[PDB]
Amino acid sequence: NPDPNANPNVDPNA
């Protein structure tokens, strides 16, 4: 699964 802390600027939810 992706690491949501790899880039904090990315919000995975749509």
Binding site for other proteins (CB under 8 A): 1-3, 5-14
Beta carbon of residue 5, minimum distance to other proteins (angstroms, whole number): 7
Answer yes or no: are the C-beta atoms of 12 and 2 closer than 8 Å: yes
Beta carbon of residue 13, minimum distance to other proteins (angstroms, whole number): 7
Beta carbon of residue 4, minimum distance to other proteins (angstroms, whole number): 10
d(CA 5, CA 10): 9
Positions of chain breaks in the chain, given as the residue before each break (C to N > 2.5 Å): none
